[PDB]
Symmetry: C5
Subunit: 206 residues, 5 copies
Amino acid sequence: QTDMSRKAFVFPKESDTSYVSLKAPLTKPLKAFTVCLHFYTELSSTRGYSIFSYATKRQDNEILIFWSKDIGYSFTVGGSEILFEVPEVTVAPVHICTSWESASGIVEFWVDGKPRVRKSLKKGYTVGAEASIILGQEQDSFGGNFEGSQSLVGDIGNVNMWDFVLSPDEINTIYLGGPFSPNVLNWRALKYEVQGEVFTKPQLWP
Amino acid sequence: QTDMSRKAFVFPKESDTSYVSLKAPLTKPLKAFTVCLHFYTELSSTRGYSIFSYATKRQDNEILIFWSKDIGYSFTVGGSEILFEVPEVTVAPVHICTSWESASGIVEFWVDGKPRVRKSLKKGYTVGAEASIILGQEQDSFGGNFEGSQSLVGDIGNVNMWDFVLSPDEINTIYLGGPFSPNVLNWRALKYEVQGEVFTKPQLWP
Amino acid sequence: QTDMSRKAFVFPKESDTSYVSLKAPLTKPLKAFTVCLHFYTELSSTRGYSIFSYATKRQDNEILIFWSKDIGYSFTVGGSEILFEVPEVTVAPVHICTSWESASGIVEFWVDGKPRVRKSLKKGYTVGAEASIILGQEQDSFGGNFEGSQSLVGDIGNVNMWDFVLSPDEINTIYLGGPFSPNVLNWRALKYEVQGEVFTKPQLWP
Amino acid sequence: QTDMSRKAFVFPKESDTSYVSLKAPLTKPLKAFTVCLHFYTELSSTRGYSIFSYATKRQDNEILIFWSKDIGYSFTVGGSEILFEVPEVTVAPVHICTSWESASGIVEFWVDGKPRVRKSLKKGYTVGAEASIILGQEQDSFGGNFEGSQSLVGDIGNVNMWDFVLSPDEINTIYLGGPFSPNVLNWRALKYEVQGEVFTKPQLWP
Amino acid sequence: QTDMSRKAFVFPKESDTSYVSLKAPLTKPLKAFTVCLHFYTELSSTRGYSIFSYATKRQDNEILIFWSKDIGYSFTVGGSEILFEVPEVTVAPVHICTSWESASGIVEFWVDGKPRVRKSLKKGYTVGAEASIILGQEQDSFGGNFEGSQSLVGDIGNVNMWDFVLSPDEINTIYLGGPFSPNVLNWRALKYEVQGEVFTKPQLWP
């Protein structure tokens, strides 16, 4: 466990081998969860890329935050996809917090602290705990099979995961860089493995 | 009577059966009244929907706040409609307070605290007290007969009704979330009934 | 004399009979004067209308503040007209103070506190005191002969008249709602007569 | 010498005879100098006009600040002209301070306190002291020969001249209306002669 | 060594001979370095020009910050070029800090304090110390061979160089005009040689 406060991973070269593998001390299936992270890249106006790949033995797209060109952020759970349209994109670091609950099928998507409309997805599903979490690549098969046109070039950090739905105030605090205690994946006590061209540098975002 | 402070109803699925029925302890015909409520949805640029349906035995459109695509907010009382044009629409929660008086036929429409021009409507009319108040659907017949293309997808709350015209200062306080005492329908001591896919969640708006 | 502080006249229906007649305790011809008033209407983008009609036995257009569509505010004294172009119009209440002096022919036009370029008009003229001041209509004949397409729909108040040119600081105070003492027509001690569909309500502007 | 603090000259009518003649207590040729003044007019989008005409027996355009339509401010010394492009023009009073030095040929042009790029002009020249300074007209011959299409309609004041290059801080103070001591032409102790339709009024700019 | 605080070099005439030659007390090859400087010119929308030319016996483009029209800032090291696109350009002084590291090949480009995405360039290279640093010209051969269409017209100063990568906080301080200690090239104790039409003046930027 190492403190990545004020640090981020760098993926400077578009490639199909540079990636960082994350290990979650997970033991129970998730009925709900939220994920927050900073990322910064200029590919938005160019081609699609993968923000966060959570994969399991049954599905290569167990959880996938994906940008599709001219469309926006594409959130998918259990192999279904909603879209959250972004008409115009700005060139700057962006913070995003997304949360899903099994009971209602509600999905909350927060971009830059402003909440998007709630929607429905895969009501009654169960997300398995046997996970491979990968960053900088979209994983179409368990622990491998990446795509260069889906690999992400840029800077990312502060990745934190919970297993229950936070309240709006809480999201505001996360945005506010306040104290908080993630209980599934800790940026503050994180465990990781690096592969290929990846590097550790101070974060650009404040 | 339950306190819905900081809470709203959620209609996530476009459907013709999810709706919430509200009971007003009303005993006198309204010579005037104001209604305030928060709502948030992205259908504005897509298709028409119903904000607030007040219906009685004589008219399915006794009071109707309705968005008509490319037009704006459409207010109707006793079966007549004015229009309040909105040239461009923004994607964010919006607050609206509307008031009508029997004596003059004046209608005041407040959107985001900025008052629209006063207009005329149905001077000398009487609104009956035998009411069915429905939310999330447009009711074309007493207690039923909804339309999927008119059902509203999104988040709403803080619905409050008076029976006399408030002053502009008062509207400002309402916007300001100050203390106030509604005497027909209380969000603070509200009575309700829920049907179909509807849920209670914390509000997104501040 | 009644105090109209925080009050305005309402003309909700486009008509040729609703109007309010104002009586000035005037006894000397005006060599100069300023007029200030608030008005609010959405007809700006639709058709022309009359802001303030000052008429006498010799001229139906002794003083006329008139909006001409696609052109802007049209100020006329003694039967001649300048134009003050407004390229684009916003939908909100607008304050306007205009002043004319017989000695120089200078006309000062203030809109929302920002001064327009000074211009020339009818140098050496005399405005008569035998006046009929009318609001909400353009008067083409002494005390009558209105035009529906020139009648004004909306809300107006704070109408005040002096008989000498105020300084820019003074205009700023007027805009600032400071204390002031009009000596020809007092909103604070005003005298009036109402005809047709006209009503008294609290002002919308702050 | 009269104090024109808070006062400006008015040229309301486009004409070829209204002008104001200024007398400088000048006795030495200028190796450098700066000139500052306020002016306000709406002709910018219509036709060209003259801001400041400094003329001598040898050249009708010894110094000329001239607006050329669709181009911008045109500064000329000793019969040569640079251009300072203005893409779009706003309708408001504008302050301008310009300075030239004989040693380097550098010209500094300040508009609304923001400095334009330095440029070169007429290096090694000498400006003569036998001057006729004219305002509101472009003078193509010593003390006469004006052009209606070059005469300026509007309001101007605060005209001050030095004979050495001020520093940027100094310009900032001038903009800031701070205390300062001009040594060639004083608005504070100015000497003038008026001809035709010209008048003295309080300034509109703050 | 002379203090150029609050001073800049001026290149007013487009020419192929006016230039300023800078001598670095350098004795070791650079494994990394950052360079910061202010510059101001209006050629951005007209033609390409050279910001900073660092040249050695082996390469005329050892380091080159170059603006290419319709493209933006073009950074090149060891004869390779990345591009940092600028969609639209504003007319004002601009501050730029750029840094490169031999270990990773990372390049950081800061414009107006806002960081551009990190990229890759020439990993494992070595920059030689036998340098000719030239300003206002692009040098295609050791100590000569300039191009008029590449010469830069305008005002520049505050040029400072380090030999290791500063942190983001540090860049912020540089932008903030805070105290700092450059160890390769000091604006505060700078050594220089001037040739042709170049002059020393107070800086325009704050």
